[PDB]
Amino acid sequence: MATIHPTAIVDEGARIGAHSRIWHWVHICGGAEIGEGCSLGQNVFVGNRVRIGNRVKIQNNVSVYDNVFLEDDVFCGPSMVFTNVYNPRAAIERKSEYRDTIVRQGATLGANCTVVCGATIGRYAFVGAGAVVNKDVPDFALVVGVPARQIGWMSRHGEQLDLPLRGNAEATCPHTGERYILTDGVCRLA
Amino acid sequence: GHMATIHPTAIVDEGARIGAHSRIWHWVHICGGAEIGEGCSLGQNVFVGNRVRIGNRVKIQNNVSVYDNVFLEDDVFCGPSMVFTNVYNPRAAIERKSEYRDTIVRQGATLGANCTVVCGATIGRYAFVGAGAVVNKDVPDFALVVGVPARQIGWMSRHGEQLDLPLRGNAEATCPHTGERYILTDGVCRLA
Amino acid sequence: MATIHPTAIVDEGARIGAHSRIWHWVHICGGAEIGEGCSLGQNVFVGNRVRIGNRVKIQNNVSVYDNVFLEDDVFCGPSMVFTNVYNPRAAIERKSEYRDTIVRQGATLGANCTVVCGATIGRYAFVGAGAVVNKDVPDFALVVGVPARQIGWMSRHGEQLDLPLRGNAEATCPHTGERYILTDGVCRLA
Numbered sequence: 001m002a003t004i005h006p007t008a009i010v011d012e013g014a015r016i017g018a019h020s021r022i023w024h025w026v027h028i029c030g031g032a033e034i035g036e037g038c039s040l041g042q043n044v045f046v047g048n049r050v051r052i053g054n055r056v057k058i059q060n061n062v063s064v065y066d067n068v069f070l071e072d073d074v075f076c077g078p079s080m081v082f083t084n085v086y087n088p089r090a091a092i093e094r095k096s097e098y099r100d101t102i103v104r105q106g107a108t109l110g111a112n113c114t115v116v117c118g119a120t121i122g123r124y125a126f127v128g129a130g131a132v133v134n135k136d137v138p139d140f141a142l143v144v145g146v147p148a149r150q151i152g153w154m155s156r157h158g159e160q161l162d163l164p165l166r167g168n169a170e171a172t173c174p175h176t177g178e179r180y181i182l183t184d185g186v187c188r189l190a
Numbered sequence: 191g192h193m194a195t196i197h198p199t200a201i202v203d204e205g206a207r208i209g210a211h212s213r214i215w216h217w218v219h220i221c222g223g224a225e226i227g228e229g230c231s232l233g234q235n236v237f238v239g240n241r242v243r244i245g246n247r248v249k250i251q252n253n254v255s256v257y258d259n260v261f262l263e264d265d266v267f268c269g270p271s272m273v274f275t276n277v278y279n280p281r282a283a284i285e286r287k288s289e290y291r292d293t294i295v296r297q298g299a300t301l302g303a304n305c306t307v308v309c310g311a312t313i314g315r316y317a318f319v320g321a322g323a324v325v326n327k328d329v330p331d332f333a334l335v336v337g338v339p340a341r342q343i344g345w346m347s348r349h350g351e352q353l354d355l356p357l358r359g360n361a362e363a364t365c366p367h368t369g370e371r372y373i374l375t376d377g378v379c380r381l382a
Numbered sequence: 383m384a385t386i387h388p389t390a391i392v393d394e395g396a397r398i399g400a401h402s403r404i405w406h407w408v409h410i411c412g413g414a415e416i417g418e419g420c421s422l423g424q425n426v427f428v429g430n431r432v433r434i435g436n437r438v439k440i441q442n443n444v445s446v447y448d449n450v451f452l453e454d455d456v457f458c459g460p461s462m463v464f465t466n467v468y469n470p471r472a473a474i475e476r477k478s479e480y481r482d483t484i485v486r487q488g489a490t491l492g493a494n495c496t497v498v499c500g501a502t503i504g505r506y507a508f509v510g511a512g513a514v515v516n517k518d519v520p521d522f523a524l525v526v527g528v529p530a531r532q533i534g535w536m537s538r539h540g541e542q543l544d545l546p547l548r549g550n551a552e553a554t555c556p557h558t559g560e561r562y563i564l565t566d567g568v569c570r571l572a
């Protein structure tokens with residue numbers, strides 16, 4: 001019962017869950033699987049070998065290529081960019097050499113960021129606008145820059161935690177008060 | 191032949207106000223609340239939201255989404271695939287319509303190709319944002335800013351070439367193309 | 383001769399060679415010349431004063447504006463960005479001041495990179511994802527960053543060569559055995 005703009009093209013075979021919204025001039029390939037309550041903005045593209053979970057918000061001009069997997073509650077900001085071939089050359093087809101990109105639950109991919117294929121983006125990570133991610137991003141990490149480097153940690157709500165990057169510590173979300181534990185430089189929810 | 195108006199493939203929703211002599215190109219979608227002035231150009235796959243005002247002689251290149259809460263004064267230039275935003279710290283599971291921040295671009299400013307403006311910034315008159323920069327703080331009138339994140343490296347004339355003015359302090363410079371005079375007062379540049 | 387998606391608009395006059403594929407909602411202007419075996423992805427734009435060679439792969443959301451020239455076997459990654467006016471101001475028409483961008487054979491332009499007009503990108507150069515190029519890129523140079531700086535040398539195959547960044551040296555691609563010579567910091571096939 002997904003609603004699909006009449007100008008969108010959803011190829012036979014594609015599966016789109018209930019309450020999803022597909023906007024103007026979107027193309028979804030027939031292999032694609034998209035969950036419930038998603039939103040796909042103007043000119044989105046989705047390939048065949050793609051799984052998108054529930055409540056995923058994909059803004060305008062995002063191309064979700066083959067070998068990209070988005071867990072539930074992922075946010076893909078305006079004009080952010082995925083890839084699936086690491087070292088493309090026009091003369092050499094590298095279909096068989098695709099690298100996976102996995103975006104874990106609740107991660108936010110800022111506007112106009114780019115993700116080099118092969119990276120995993122952890123749960124509730126936050127990739128600043130314009131960043132170029134070329135390594136794995138820890139759960140809750142705030143990363144910015146070209147290439148992206150970690151400068152802090154972000155709570156689920158989306159504000160920085162008073163927690164060092166390394167070692168062992170604990171902190172609370174400035175909004176909800178919920179506690180996070182850092183152990184050897186890895187952040188988790190308590 | 192005849193002058194282009196609004197390409198037939200564009201979708202201009204009922205209620206949109208578009209001024210005379212503006213050109214709207216292929217597969218543009220303009221929402222019903224928008225207002226767009228005279229003499230504007232909107233490139234391929236532009237999107238324009240409802241809560242948007244665009245002045246006169248605004249040139250918006252391909253693949254720019256002028257989302258709700260973005261406001262563009264006369265003579266602004268939005269380069270190819272530059273990107274605006276309206277939520278500072280988006281999370282898919284957190285509704286943030288009530289927390290949008292306005293982005294205001296003042297007269298004559300240039301936003302280079304593939305730059306990004308983090309919401310809430312104000313871009314000053316005749317500012318120049320280099321290609322690919324990421325703006326996350328206000329940009330003074332006439333400032334030339336580049337980089338991720340953007341830092342000021344000079345001052346640009348209205349004509350669009352750097353002025354011989356220091357970044358800080360008091361100074362004066364003249365545009366050699368027009369002879370227009372600029373005055374720097376404690377690091378703030380104005381046209382004389 | 384090309385295959386053209388029915389939603390594409392290819393203006394009268396445009397020349398597109400055999401075995402080319404034009405995908406959804408692409409607009410090609412009537413002065414354009416595109417060679418054989420090219421692929422133009424979703425929402426590509428091609429201007430009038432444009433020559434694109436053979437086997438050029440142009441991914442989604444690339445606008446090949448007037449005064450951009452792409453040699454054979456060029457790869458333009460997802461949402462990379464060309465320009466033709468150096469210092470745009472909406473009040474001043476600068477058609478007459480366009481600066482050329484020439485991309486030489488086999489160069490790769492990574493996803494979401496940007497090229498400031500006037501640059502020449504050398505043969506088999508490799509511009510990293512997200513870079514902003516504002517100076518000429520040597521043949522075979524690997525450049526990254528905003529603005530782009532050279533960090534190594536890429537073989538035709540698209541893997542770094544065992545060459546110093548500067549100086550005089552030689553190296554061999556392990557995949558093909560082809561030999562490269564670095565002379566005063568200029569790399570060429572022997």
Ligand SMILES: CC(=O)SCCNC(=O)CCNC(=O)[C@H](O)C(C)(C)COP(=O)(O)OP(=O)(O)OC[C@H]1O[C@@H](n2cnc3c(N)ncnc32)[C@H](O)[C@@H]1OP(=O)(O)O
Nearest residue numbers: 065083084085086088146147459492493510511526527542
């Ligand atoms: C649909 C499609 O996907 S089409 C295909 C489009 N694909 C792409 O555009 C992907 C382009 N790939 C890249 O940019 C890759 O990062 C490559 C090919 C440049 C990496 O090349 P490699 O030789 O493996 O270099 P390596 O990863 O060892 O990096 C060397 C240094 O350059 C840095 N670097 C590498 N790539 C980038 C980049 N794009 N931007 C900034 N820095 C970069 C690395 O961070 C490292 O520096 P550090 O040690 O200071 O962190």
Ligand SMILES: CC(=O)SCCNC(=O)CCNC(=O)[C@H](O)C(C)(C)COP(=O)(O)OP(=O)(O)OC[C@H]1O[C@@H](n2cnc3c(N)ncnc32)[C@H](O)[C@@H]1OP(=O)(O)O
Nearest residue numbers: 077110111128129144145160257275276277278280338339
């Ligand atoms: C339609 C739609 O708009 S959907 C919503 C899309 N919205 C977005 O993509 C916005 C993304 N937001 C951002 O990137 C923001 O800059 C945030 C959320 C990362 C800022 O997080 P904050 O915790 O407030 O960080 P803060 O602003 O204090 O910056 C900390 C440091 O990081 C730098 N920084 C922050 N963001 C960036 C960025 N995107 N790129 C590079 N540097 C950055 C700052 O400049 C500062 O360093 P400095 O002191 O040397 O100048």
Ligand SMILES: CC(=O)SCCNC(=O)CCNC(=O)[C@H](O)C(C)(C)COP(=O)(O)OP(=O)(O)OC[C@H]1O[C@@H](n2cnc3c(N)ncnc32)[C@H](O)[C@@H]1OP(=O)(O)O
Nearest residue numbers: 269302303320321336337352447465466467468470528529
């Ligand atoms: C269809 C269409 O094309 S519409 C037109 C769209 N066109 C554009 O968006 C082009 C925008 N132009 C630019 O970004 C240009 O680089 C300009 C105008 C900012 C250059 O301005 P100039 O005054 O000539 O500066 P200049 O080239 O001397 O550079 C000064 C310094 O800034 C750096 N710099 C210049 N532009 C950039 C940039 N975009 N990003 C990062 N650094 C930059 C230079 O590398 C130099 O630094 P360095 O000496 O430490 O390397």
Ligand SMILES: O=c1ccn([C@@H]2O[C@H](COP(=O)(O)OP(=O)(O)O)[C@@H](O)[C@H]2O)c(=O)[nH]1
Nearest residue numbers: 213215216231232233234251252409411427
């Ligand atoms: O002959 C033309 C002129 C313009 N455009 C479209 O208009 C945008 C703006 O082009 P230009 O900068 O020349 O704008 P104009 O001032 O001519 O509207 C281009 O990217 C294309 O989207 C086009 O398709 N054909």
Ligand SMILES: O=c1ccn([C@@H]2O[C@H](COP(=O)(O)OP(=O)(O)O)[C@@H](O)[C@H]2O)c(=O)[nH]1
Nearest residue numbers: 027029045403405406421422423424441442
């Ligand atoms: O089955 C397909 C194959 C390709 N594409 C479109 O073609 C572009 C380029 O695809 P690919 O790199 O696979 O290019 P090819 O060389 O196969 O034309 C994709 O981004 C889509 O726009 C598509 O819609 N369906």
Ligand SMILES: O=c1ccn([C@@H]2O[C@H](COP(=O)(O)O)[C@@H](O)[C@H]2O)c(=O)[nH]1
Nearest residue numbers: 023024039040041042059060219221237
């Ligand atoms: O009234 C609307 C709401 C949404 N959109 C399209 O949906 C995208 C997602 O909007 P939102 O879900 O972020 O509000 C917008 O970028 C645009 O593509 C519209 O065109 N009109």
Ligand code: NA
Nearest residue numbers: 079271304461
């Ligand atoms: Na971009």
